[PDB]
């Protein structure tokens, strides 16, 4: 079983990335092969100028091809996903998520814009042909107590993450 | 009267940018001060890693502050605007478009996704507090005859552009 995790925040460390950190740990407890990527792992000029011959993109697309699922996280920037994350999604082959389960995760300042980022991400993931897009976990900033050390969440957010991850695990089989 | 034009495509030249090229020409005929920017005018590492101390961002935000209107163009990538364009929008101050008229332009492969990019751009421009977001011009690729030489459009697309630009000009007063 193989899963890719992808951090869409251009900050290091990152609040949305702390949800991914918790996921990877849950998953490694389950004997899942996890490959974690963030935007530092690509040359910025390749991403900004959509250079499809990017070496790192080749590796990333090869790892994603073998993967059964993708967990992708983003901050809410200007009522949507980060542009930095979108630069990489734009460079993925057509059908890149065909046959795969996608769990979206996000953190944001306001609940209204957490609804907005959910609505904005879905058509993009559908354009990549994701087999199923799970409901996901969209949490306001106050729900993350610590994203600099060991991730710490409110009980509500930890429960929502655990549910989503169990749903993700089952959807993979 | 001052207008910023902003090309969101990471390609040079670009089909969506040819609509901007036509706009800038119409506008310079009207005695409008036009400042044109594209993603080559920023350091890619500043955009991908959301570096708010970017020197070019400072200049761009200063020119935009003095501007009365913005014409922004994007390709349709994965049923939305380009991530490359979003990386720059993400770096604009809150309220960056307060008091300003915005004309969105886009080119894409399919009509269905031209509706999608219209719906995706609006909340982002609203998050930047644009005073009015014009209907805009969203054209499929077959409507651009030439974007490498002097821009050439089908009569239908040229008419739609001329209408939109007249609407933009009036909205500015
Ligand atoms: C440039 C920038 C733009 C933001 N725009 C929004 C917004 O439009 N709506 C909102 O609710 N939160 C907004 N936020 C708050 C972030 O979504 C929130 O703090 C998020 O948890 C940051 O996640 P990260 O640490 O993983 O980058 C913005 C933050 C930044 C830095
Ligand atoms: C609703 C909301 C919207 C925000 N929008 C922005 C924005 O558009 N640009 C920005 O620089 N910060 C924005 N912020 C603030 C960032 O969260 C704040 O600057 C934080 O200290 C950034 O830290 P970071 O870069 O580590 O994420 C927003 C915050 C909230 C709650
Ligand atoms: C990476 C990439 C992704 C694209 N994704 C879409 C899409 O999801 N839906 C669509 O209708 N057209 C899609 N297209 C076609 C472009 O929107 C269209 O060719 C556009 O005119 C290119 O504009 P530009 O020359 O200004 O970059 C895509 C093109 C590229 C290069
Ligand atoms: C609906 C539609 C969707 C497309 N989606 C993609 C895509 O996701 N990735 C890509 O590389 N090309 C995509 N293309 C194709 C590009 O338009 C094509 O590769 C073109 O030759 C790219 O030229 P350009 O990079 O100069 O824009 C799409 C085309 C259409 C009509």
From Swiss-Prot, chains A, B:
Protein induction: Repressed by sulfate or cysteine.
Gene Ontology BP terms: alkanesulfonate catabolic process; cellular response to sulfate starvation; DNA damage response
Record GO terms (molecular function): FMN reductase (NADPH) activity; FMN reductase [NAD(P)H] activity; protein homodimerization activity
Keywords tagged on the record: Flavoprotein, FMN, NADP, Oxidoreductase
Keyword Flavoprotein assigned: yes
A single GO cellular-component term on record: FMN reductase complex
Pfam families named among the record's database cross-references: FMN_red
Tree of life domain: Bacteria
Protein task: Catalyzes an NADPH-dependent reduction of FMN, but is also able to reduce FAD or riboflavin.
Family designation: Belongs to the SsuE family.
Subunit structure: Homodimer.
Name of the protein described by the UniProt record: FMN reductase (NADPH)
């Amino acid at each position: 079983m193989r899963v890719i995790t992808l951090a869409g925040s251009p900050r290091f460390p990152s609040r949305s990335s702390s949800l991914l950190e918790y996921a990877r740990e849950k998953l490694n407890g389950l004997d899942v092969e996890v490959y974690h990527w963030n935007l530092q792992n690509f040359a910025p000029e390749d991403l900004l100028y959509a250079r499809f011959d990017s070496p790192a993109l080749k590796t990333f697309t090869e790892q994603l091809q073998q993967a059964d699922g993708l967990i992708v996280a983003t901050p809410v920037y200007k009522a949507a996903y980060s542009g930095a994350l979108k630069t990489l999604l734009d460079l993925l082959p057509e059908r890149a998520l065909q046959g795969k389960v996608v769990l979206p995760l996000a953190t944001g300042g306001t609940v209204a814009h957490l609804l907005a980022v959910d609505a904005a991400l879905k058509p993009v993931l559908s354009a990549l042909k994701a087999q199923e897009i799970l409901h996901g976990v969209f949490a306001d900033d106050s729900q993350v107590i610590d994203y600099h050390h060991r991730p710490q969440f409110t009980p509500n957010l930890q429960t929502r993450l655990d549910t989503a991850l169990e749903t993700f695990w089952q959807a993979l089989h």
